[PDB]
Amino acid sequence: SYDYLFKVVLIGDSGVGKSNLLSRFTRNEFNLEIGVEFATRSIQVDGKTIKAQIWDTITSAYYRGAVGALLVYDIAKHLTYENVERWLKELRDHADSNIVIMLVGNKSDLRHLRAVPTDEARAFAEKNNLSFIETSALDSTNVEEAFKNILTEIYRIVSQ
């Protein structure tokens, strides 16, 4: 089985693709359509087996033990990005101080309908010590790269 087990939570406004980011990473599925659930996926990092349980959508229990967080917005819906500030505060208030956070701009496949400039998003991320990457759960772009990125940053940290 696994060597490590990391809890990673997905936060962000409804409809940004959190559920689809989870389904594509854990079972390579995308759809077009509650309570609290999670799914697991194992990857290799430094010869070690890292099992990630990714959580989607009690607020204190949700963040409890979370070592990673993907703050997700919609690059075609600027409203979802304006609310990133609110989600970040919920993280800072209800989670660990050493949690690894990545700002994820989903639906990169809608570049022609982009409402959030990537330079502006990265500027926000860099100032707030957040990782940043644009993804597309639809056509599977940077999804593996996103999760593998955050799971590696977490791993290197706990390797102390």
Residue 17 interacts with ligand GDP (CB under 6 A)? yes
Residue 131 interacts with ligand GDP (CB under 6 A)? no
Comparison of 67 and 116: residue with beta carbon closer to another protein: 67
- Distance CA(153)–CA(146), nearest Å, equals 11
Bridge partner list, 136 = 141
Q: Give the DSSP H or E segment for 129.
A: none
Q: Is 28 annotated as a binding residue?
A: no
Q: Is 77 annotated as a binding residue?
A: no
Residue 25 interacts with another protein (CB under 8 A)? no
Residue with tokens 């390579």: 28
Give how far Cα 39 sits from Cα of 21, 28, 51, 98, 149, Å. Answer: 11, 12, 10, 23, 18
Residue 109 interacts with ligand GDP (CB under 6 A)? yes
Residue 62 interacts with another protein (CB under 8 A)? yes
Q: Which residues bind another protein (CB under 8 A)?
A: 1-7, 34-37, 48, 53, 58, 60-62, 64-65, 67, 158-159
